[PDB]
Structure formats: C-alpha cells, structure tokens
C-alpha cells in the first residue's frame, strides 16, 4: 500500500513499532536484497564501536540489505551512499547537510546524522539514523530543529529511499562516482586530530581514492586515515 | 517511521512491492501474532477454493497473522472481524458498506471487500481484499467509484489497521460482542439462495449464537447454514 516505485532499495519493507536494533535484526534474519528494516523506536540502537544511538520515537531508523556484484575493493563506499543520500534528503526539506569524515552529516556542525554499514556472511547492512522530529543529545540536531516545525517522517522515509535507490543502483555501474558525491558534500580544509595510539593532527584535505582520509600534518608529512574504529576531532 | 499505535495487530508491517498472495505468504513464513502482510499487488491472489483475486495496484491487498486466545468454537467468528472492520472503515469514509453473510462487503448490492480466513494449528490468517483505487471485475466496485474521488491508500491502511486492532482485542475478551456488530450492519430481510450441496431459498433472517445464517423457507422450515463450502446469492 505504500507504492514504491523503486528499483531494489524498498522492493521488501519490513516495519517495527518497537525493535532493539534494525542493523542487528538485518544481520541475524535472511532477507532479499534491497529489504529495508525500519522502526519507530530502537531499544538498543547503536552506532560505530560501543557506543549507544538514541533512537526515541520522531526520528528515522533503518537499515538495507545490500550484497553488491562488485569488487571487493569498493566495498567500504557503501556508507557514503549512505551520508549523501542523506545529504541529498535534506536539500529537498530545505537543510544544507555536510558529511564529517566518514559516517556522519552534521548541519553547522550539529549531528543530524549518523551512517553504520556492518556485514554478516556476504550481506551488506547499511544502517542510517537520522533525527527528524525526535528529541536529540545535547550538541546534536534534528530536521523539526532546524526548519522550526513537524516534519513528516514518512515523507523523509519515501525521499531517503528513492535517492539511496538511485545512488545504489549507479554505484553498481560506476562504483567510483560516489567519491566525487562526497568531496563535493563533505568538510574540509580544517585541522583535525585522530585520537588513539599514535595520535596526530592537521589538515583534513580530502579523501583519496578508496575513501581514505588524507592528512596533512603541519611538519608536511602525508597521512591515510582508513575508516573504521577511528575517532577524529575538530579542532 | 508508520508510528502505528494499535496493540497486537500492527505491531510488524511487512510490505511488499509485489506478492504472489499475502495469504500465502503468512501461512508459509515464520511470524509473530499481530504481523501485517500487505502488497501493492498481487500475482496469485485468491479466494476460496483457490478462486482467482484480482489484485491490480491501487486496492488494499492485506492478511493479518493470529493466534486467538479463545475457545476453538469461537474461531469460526474471525472473518466477520475482518468484514466489520472493513464495514467501520469504509463508514469512515462515508461509503455504506454492507455486510453480505459471511465474508463480503457490499456497497449497493456491489463487492468491495472479501475476506478469506486460513487456519492450521496456533496461527489464523486473516486476509482481506479491498478495492479502493484500482479497477475491479464486473459485480464489483471500489472506494474510488463509490466516491467519485481517489482515496490516500495508506489512510485507508490506517483506519482498517486501527479498527481491527481494537475489534480483535475486544474479541479475546467477549467473543460474542462480534455478532452484535455483524448484525447490525449486514443485509437481512430479503430472499437469498443458499448453494452448496444442492440448493434452497428463503429469506435470511439473522445470525445465531454461532454465527450460523438463519433461514426461513417459503414453507416456513428454518435452515441453520454454517459457513463450509456454501455461497449465497440474492435474488
Ligand atoms: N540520535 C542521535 N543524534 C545525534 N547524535 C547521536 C544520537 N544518538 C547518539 N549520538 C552520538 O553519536 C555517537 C555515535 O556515533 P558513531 O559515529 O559511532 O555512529 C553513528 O553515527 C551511527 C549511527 C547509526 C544509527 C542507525 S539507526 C538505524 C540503524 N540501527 C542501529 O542500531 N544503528 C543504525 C554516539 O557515541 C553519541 O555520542
Ligand atoms: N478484486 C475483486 N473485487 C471484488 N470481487 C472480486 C475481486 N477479484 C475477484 N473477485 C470475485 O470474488 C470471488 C472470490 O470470492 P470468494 O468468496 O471465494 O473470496 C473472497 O471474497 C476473499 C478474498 C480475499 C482476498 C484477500 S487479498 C489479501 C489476501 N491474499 C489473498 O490471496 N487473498 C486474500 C471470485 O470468484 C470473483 O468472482
């Protein structure tokens, strides 16, 4: 009854009044390609890592299954699809979104956003959380926050998966495009600091090829930062 | 993101571009009591007897899983939930629907909704077909043409979810308030040919205790017809 007219992301969609988690719920149950998993409230949502997402009734939670035919080197591009699917969502409601470095879309500077793609056997889960109307950590934000007023949830629902439909279906072709989507959304040209053992900061100038994050540190040297258990600051 | 708040149906929605039937699917698949399977279309719709649905886009494709906390000689009443909630529904939308004794929906003697109950054990499924913004077989109608004007799918998904949550929850409590509600909204009073194994007429009457339709022959014998492999048929 929905009338979904996209191509594989949507075919299949699986909503939950209540759920502790819809990456974990895609991950443990066999589910066609292109099945979104989507609920109201999450009860053990989560994001990279350790670390709890607030999932309160208002905002959009979900995750895809994907199992893209291509090689294995662009796997880790599938949470870009993410972040400028979202990116490319909140241009249409009006909200200019820019993607922080490798999963999150932050609206001058507040979180909106949050992108954390797992995979179980050879599924890809690309799991994406955004605060529509729902109330928001402290420092965070929300699409009813930035515009000032209720915004339809289900409206975000059929936007978000119309572009991330496009998006997917394009990158199974040319797998290389998203970078430039991303370059062209993301921030840039700012000191950063990548926390953990060995720790440095400089200039996060962009991103390579493989989605690496290149760093300049100020004695020149020349750094990769992968994405993955990273923790990087703004300074 | 639906934001359903019924209790026990509704809980799950599993929605899908296309189905072969929703029936078939919940009678096959492992799922939870309260679990909603709705299609915008149907391949292989079906009646009973496996008589063909038809299941074009724009109409309410839908089956309910169940598993009544009630007696067995109460399970027998399931379908006139599904056709009470369709008849609330529509009266929502100031259509008349009528029921048409035991699984039909009528608007000026014209079906719109046809519910089809399948059991094995501790699941029920309830399915019902309604049509609503597509083109129907001749001997049928829709909300569509009944109004005059195209109607929101998914508020009509709405409205029959919510009432049928709140009828099934009455149900398991009094079993018997169904029949009051069956009664009050079907079409009685009027001759009608009962064919099943062989055939007779007489005017329908009412509803008993069971659910049974009462029949008063010309000669002035009362017949008790139980809903098996019977089909009635106005004059
Ligand atoms: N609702 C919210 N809005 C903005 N920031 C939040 C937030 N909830 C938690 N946070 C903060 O953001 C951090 C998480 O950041 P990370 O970069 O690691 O992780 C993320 O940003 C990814 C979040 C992915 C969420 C979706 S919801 C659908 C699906 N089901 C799941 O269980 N997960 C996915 C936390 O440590 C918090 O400090
Ligand atoms: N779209 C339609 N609208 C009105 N009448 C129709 C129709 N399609 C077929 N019919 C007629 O209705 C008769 C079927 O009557 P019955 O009394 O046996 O059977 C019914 O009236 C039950 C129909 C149940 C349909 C739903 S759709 C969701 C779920 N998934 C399924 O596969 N089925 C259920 C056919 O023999 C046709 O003459």
Chains 1, 2 share one sequence.
Not at 120 to 130: F, H, M, N, P, Q
Not at 140 to 161: D, N, W, Y
């Amino acid at each position: 009854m929905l009338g979904l007219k996209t191509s594989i992301i949507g075919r299949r969609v699986i909503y939950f009044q209540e759920i502790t988690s819809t990456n974990e719920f895609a991950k443990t149950s066999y589910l066609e390609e292109g099945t979104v998993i989507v609920a109201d409230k999450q009860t053990m949502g989560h994001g990279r890592l350790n670390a709890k997402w607030e999932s309160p009734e208002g905002g959009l939670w979900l995750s895809i299954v994907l199992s893209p035919k291509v090689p294995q080197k662009d796997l880790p591009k599938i949470v870009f699809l993410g972040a400028v699917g979202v990116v490319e969502t909140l241009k249409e409601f009006s909200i200019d979104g820019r993607i922080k470095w490798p999963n999150d879309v932050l609206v001058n500077y507040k979180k909106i956003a949050g992108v954390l793609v797992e995979g179980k056997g050879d599924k890809i889960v690309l799991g994406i959380g955004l605060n529509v109307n729902n109330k928001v950590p402290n420092g965070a934000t929300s699409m009813k926050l930035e515009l000032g007023s209720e915004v339809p949830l289900l409206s975000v629902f059929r936007s978000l998966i119309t572009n991330l439909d496009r998006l997917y279906l394009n990158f199974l072709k040319n797998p290389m495009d998203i970078l430039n989507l991303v370059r062209d959304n993301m921030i840039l040209g700012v000191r950063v600091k990548i926390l953990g053992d060995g720790s440095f900061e400089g200039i996060a100038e962009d991103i390579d090829d493989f989605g690496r994050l290149i760093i300049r540190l100020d004695s020149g040297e020349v750094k990769k930062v992968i994405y993955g258990d990273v923790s990087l600051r703004f300074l």
